Every structure is written in C-alpha cells, then in structure tokens.
Amino acid sequence: SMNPPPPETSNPNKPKRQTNQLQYLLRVVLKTLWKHQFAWPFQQPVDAVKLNLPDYYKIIKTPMDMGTIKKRLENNYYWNAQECIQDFNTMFTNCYIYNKPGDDIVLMAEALEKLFLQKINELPTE
C-alpha cells in the first residue's frame, strides 16, 4: 500500500494524436536522455518500498517518470508536445520537491533537465 498505482499510460476516453513533434520527443528526446548515465533513477516510478522512501508519496501527489512518459508516447496518449513536456517538467520538479539542493539524486535531475532543455529548444515543424 506504500506505493500507489502508477500513472495511466492509456485512457480510452482521451483522444490520441500523432505529430512530428511528438515523434521527435520519443525518438530523439526521451530515447537519448534514457541512455544518459544519470537516467536510471527516472526510468520507472519511484518504488517507495524498494528504495526505503516510505514518505515519498505522502509528499509527491503527481508522480511522473520517464518509463511512464515513454509508454505514453508509444501509446500516442498525448494530444500535443506541450502535454508531454509538462510530464517531463513534473518529473524534474517532483525530484526537487522531495529532495534538497546538493543531493546526489538532485545533481542527476539537474543535469538531465539541462540536456532535456537543450533538446526541446528546437522541435521539428508540422
């Protein structure tokens, strides 16, 4: 019970869309960040039981991780790039909320966020 259900990766009453920008967010942005040496903490939902973080979901009420984002992109779950970028930003912000400046996990998120921003600065045109 320490872990809530992970965020949904499909929703039949939500419309889907496929765009050049969403394709780029999967092929270039997510799949490149995924290979970074600091990506591993963010490739799956925070497991509060395995990680000995029993208060994580007492603090973080909109969890997000790159595994969820990846599955959402593979499902064409998002309407537009902004919706996907919002999930990335939630993932980073959650890490800064739960942890403190200078923590190793925060140094990891800070470096990934910089790479993320570099890659979404220019997106393809439709």
Ligand X SMILES: Cn1nnc2ccc(Cc3cccc(CO)c3)cc21
Q: By CB under 6 A, is residue 105 in contact with ligand X?
A: yes
Out of 26, 41, 115, 119, the only residue in the binding site for ligand X (CB under 6 A) is 41
In this structure, what token pair is assigned to residue 65? 């991780």
Q: Identify residue 99 by its one-letter amino acid code.
A: N
Q: Which is nearer to ligand X, 8 or 104 (CB)?
A: 104
Q: Which stretch binds ligand X (CB under 6 A): 12-20, 68-76, 79-87, 103-111?
A: 103-111
- Contacts with ligand X by CB under 6 A: the residue count is 11
Out of 29, 69, 81, 95, the only residue in the binding site for ligand X (CB under 6 A) is 95
Q: By CB under 6 A, is residue 93 in contact with ligand X?
A: no
Q: By CB under 6 A, is residue 46 in contact with ligand X?
A: yes
Contact (Cβ atoms closer than 8 angstroms) between residue 70 and residue 87: no
d(CA 59, CA 42): 17
Contact (Cβ atoms closer than 8 angstroms) between residue 84 and residue 42: no
Q: Give residue 63's Cα distance to chain centre.
A: 9
